[PDB]
Amino acid sequence: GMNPPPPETSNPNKPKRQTNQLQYLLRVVLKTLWKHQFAWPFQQPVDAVKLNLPAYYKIIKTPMDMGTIKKRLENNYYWNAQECIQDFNTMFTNCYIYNKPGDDIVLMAEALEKLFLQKINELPTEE
Numbered sequence: 001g002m003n004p005p006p007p008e009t010s011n012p013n014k015p016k017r018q019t020n021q022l023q024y025l026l027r028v029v030l031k032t033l034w035k036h037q038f039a040w041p042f043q044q045p046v047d048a049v050k051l052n053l054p055a056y057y058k059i060i061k062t063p064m065d066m067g068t069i070k071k072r073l074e075n076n077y078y079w080n081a082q083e084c085i086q087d088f089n090t091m092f093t094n095c096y097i098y099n100k101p102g103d104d105i106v107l108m109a110e111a112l113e114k115l116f117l118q119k120i121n122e123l124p125t126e127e
């Protein structure tokens with residue numbers, strides 16, 4: 001089986017705005033997670049062909065990753081902060097669905113998720 005194309009990241013038919021919270025999600029939240037020791041498996045879509053995971057996209061129907069989230073933020077794909085937060089949560093949940101509890105990759109995701117949840121407790125004031 002072929003990989004699916006990556007999620008859409010730039011859509012001129014979606015409206016565009018910059019907000020305090022979206023800026024913070026890119027410049028603080030994503031930036032912080034991106035540099036984490038365990039970030040790298042989450043920095044791009046799962047390449048199921050390269051990684052020999054034929055069942056991955058048979059179960060994960062809403063793939064998401066931080067490379068995609070970063071591009072979405074950079075291209076003003078999100079209007080509301082919650083849309084971005086939801087994508088991070090989808091990324092973590094996908095990992096917890098496909099992989100057995102306690103697996104290495106799950107422990108990595110859990111560490112990132114803990115940091116993520118801490119950082120979004122510090123969002124700046126909304127317009």
Ligand SMILES: Cc1noc(C)c1-c1cnc2c(-c3ccc(C(=O)O)cc3)cn([C@@H](C)c3ccccn3)c2c1
Pocket residue numbers: 040041042046047051053094095098099104105108
């Ligand atoms: C499965 C799965 N479910 O959710 C995710 C997310 C994954 C996932 C995604 N990417 C990887 C990569 C990976 C990423 C980038 C590169 C690169 O050359 O740029 C090379 C390999 C390797 N692995 C395996 C071995 C791995 C890595 C660390 C710990 C345990 N297993 C991955 C697992």
